[PDB]
Amino acid sequence: DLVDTTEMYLRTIYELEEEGVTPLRARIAERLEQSGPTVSQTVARMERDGLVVVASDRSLQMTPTGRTLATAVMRKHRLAERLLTDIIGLDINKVHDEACRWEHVMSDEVERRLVKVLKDVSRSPFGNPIPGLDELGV
Amino acid sequence: DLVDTTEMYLRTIYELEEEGVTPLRARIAERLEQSGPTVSQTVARMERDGLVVVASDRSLQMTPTGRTLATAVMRKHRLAERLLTDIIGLDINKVHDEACRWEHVMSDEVERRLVKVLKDVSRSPFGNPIPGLDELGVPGTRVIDAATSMPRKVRIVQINEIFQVETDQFTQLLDADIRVGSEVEIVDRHITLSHNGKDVELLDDLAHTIRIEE
Secondary structure: OHHHHHHHHHHHHHHHHHHOOOOOHHHHHHHHOOOHHHHHHHHHHHHHOOOEEEOOOOOEEEOHHHHHHHHHHHHHHHHHHHHHHHHHOOOHHHHHHHHHHHHHHOOHHHHHHHHHHOOOOOEOOOOOEOOOHHHHOO | OHHHHHHHHHHHHHHHHHHOOOOEHHHHHHHHOOOHHHHHHHHHHHHHOOOEEEOOOOEEEEOHHHHHHHHHHHHHHHHHHHHHHHHHOOOOOOHHHHHHHHOOOOOHHHHHHHHHHOOOOOEOOOOOEOOOHHHHOOOOEEHHHHOOOOOEEEEEEEOOHHHOOOOOOHHHHHHOOOOOOOEEEEOEOOEEEEEOOEEEEOOHHHHHHOEEEO
8 A cells, every 4th residue: 555555664764763774775675575676666656755865875864744754653653552552451472563553544633542541652662762742732 | 455445345245234234336335435346346356255246136245254254344343443432532423434444453362352451342332233252252273373483371262072083192181181271381393282281292183173262
């Protein structure tokens, strides 16, 4: 799905950065288990949508808009993990794969509610901080 | 997404049926907003997938497999609405739309957990009863499928001795106090049922028939 695939690329780029890794199409591919030509295809579309630009040095620089989108996806992704662990009680070993799906289907309104019903929305069960809370309106 | 499409298609046939409406292509198309041709192409696919049959009267008859999937999708859907209203507190005006998306991504594991965590899972906030609960668990899963590379505790639901030819391991299981209800820590390294401190390395036949639920 065009949009969902894009959100996964933006979230992946975000994570790499977060790990201190350089967003390189080959690493994105390797992390996504996808073929180079496929990631190229997708990153091309993404550029045409003004979400990313392959910097002259061939690294992937998220435009301001792409970054805002990548952040909201991660935000949802991480509120989702909190819902799963904190409330639903899902096996911790499944929280991330599930969250990888829900991040595409969760709405802003649900996010705000979760922010209001979860005891803490600072970090995810996995240690990384939950981004964009202020931009969400919570 | 083809998988998600079929699920939305099946859940809709399910809704009309429940509403007492005849599952007609024009009706479904209208409901899904999509056009009649698109629906025929998508119904054709399902028919080849053995999930639906365009009946005599031209209504859509879900095959058992179709209905089984339709029910599961509706279950996830209504379970999602309970999570959304009871726990999350999402505006009731936005619960249905949200649920139409979540039904495609909520795992069976999340469902069993919601069933445990929700106060009442008999009905959806909108009046209709939540289907497929029995087939969700709250029988069991064939040990061979439930067996993962990492151990975990599971409650025996059925051993199925009546179907066994090879009975050499019957006592082995009895000494290991592994019987109905017995929480045996299983794993896949073949499947080894561990309980009462003992371990029972099952054989293909036993592994397929013994069902451990959750």
